[PDB]
């Protein structure tokens, strides 16, 4: 595929493929010439080197290095280990309806509450604004609703405020050690780019207000809203599963 800068970019497979096809076609040419066997031998050794380098480069011998003196990424490599498809592009995923930001204290909040910035929840609940807008008849279409949101007009804040009520949000902190590494709350819109978290559940995350960031996630489906309120709500999660002991505790 071509870059924005008029450059192109290719995967290392294409390069490894050209090594296989060239040598294979050169063998067809040498079998046409009935060349001496000593040469045919080299061609067959080469062909195998290229095929083995295509399946799993760094294995049989030296992995065929390319332009930046680094080894060409082969097929097996994209199925192999952390950097493979499994662990990196399948079991772990970047996810929509997700935002992260510096967290700060919320000593006014109750246990089932958490501060969520307005401009964060704005972008997060974008399809829920367009939906409640067509209902009231303020938007006739969705690109109309898109511009209503963009202009950040006054009456759009009140609609956003409407959908968010009685709607849980998931708050995650890295690293996710135990299940309590995510808990659900009822978002409270606050003017400011900081998330405000409940002091008592800080223990579960191990979340220190010294520059911590927490990922937000919006449960879309009604089942996810029920799951978040039933299982993942902060009030329904008190005691640790490890020990029958309260992890929710002042400090």
């Amino acid at each position: 595929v071509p870059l924005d800068g008029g450059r192109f970019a290719t995967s290392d497979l294409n390069d490894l493929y050209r090594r296989v096809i060239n040598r294979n076609n050169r063998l067809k040419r040498l079998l046409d010439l009935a060349a001496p066997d000593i040469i045919v031998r080299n061609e067959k050794r080469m062909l195998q080197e290229a095929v083995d380098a295509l399946l799993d480069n760094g294995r049989r011998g030296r992995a065929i290095t390319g332009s930046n003196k680094r080894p060409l990424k082969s097929l097996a490599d994209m199925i192999k280990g952390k950097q493979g498809r499994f662990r990196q592009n399948l079991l772990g995923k970047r996810v929509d309806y997700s935002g992260r930001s510096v967290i700060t204290v919320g000593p006014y909040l109750r246990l089932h509450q958490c501060g969520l910035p307005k401009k964060m929840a704005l972008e997060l609940f974008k399809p829920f604004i367009y939906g409640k807008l067509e209902l009231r008849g303020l938007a006739t279409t969705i690109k109309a609703a898109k511009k209503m949101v963009e202009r950040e007009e006054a009456v759009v804040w009140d609609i956003l405020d409407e959908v968010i009520r009685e709607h849980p949000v998931l708050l995650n902190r890295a690293p996710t050690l135990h299940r309590l590494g995510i808990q659900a709350f009822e978002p409270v819109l606050i003017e400011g780019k900081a998330i405000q978290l409940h002091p008592l559940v800080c223990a579960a995350y191990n979340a220190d207000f010294d520059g911590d960031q927490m990922a937000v996630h919006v449960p879309l489906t009604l089942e996810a809203q029920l799951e978040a309120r039933a299982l993942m709500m902060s009030t329904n999660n008190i005691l640790s599963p490890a020990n029958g002991e309260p992890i929710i505790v002042p400090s």
């Binding site: 097996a76 280990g81 079991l91």
Partner: protein, 50 residues
């Protein structure tokens, strides 16, 4: 052992997703094994109901 008990489950998808992925697949290919899915890793991969 843990490392071995993970690679022992009939699910080869669960085994390759773990480690030794080069070996798991080759042993599973030669055996011609078919995984009928029971574990979580197996259904989270395919993006189905856990």
């Amino acid at each position: 052992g843990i490392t071995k008990a993970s690679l022992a489950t009939e699910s080869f998808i669960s085994a390759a997703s773990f480690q030794e992925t080069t070996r798991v697949l080759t042993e599973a290919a030669v055996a011609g094994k078919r995984d009928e899915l029971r574990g979580l890793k197996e259904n989270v991969i395919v993006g189905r109901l856990i």
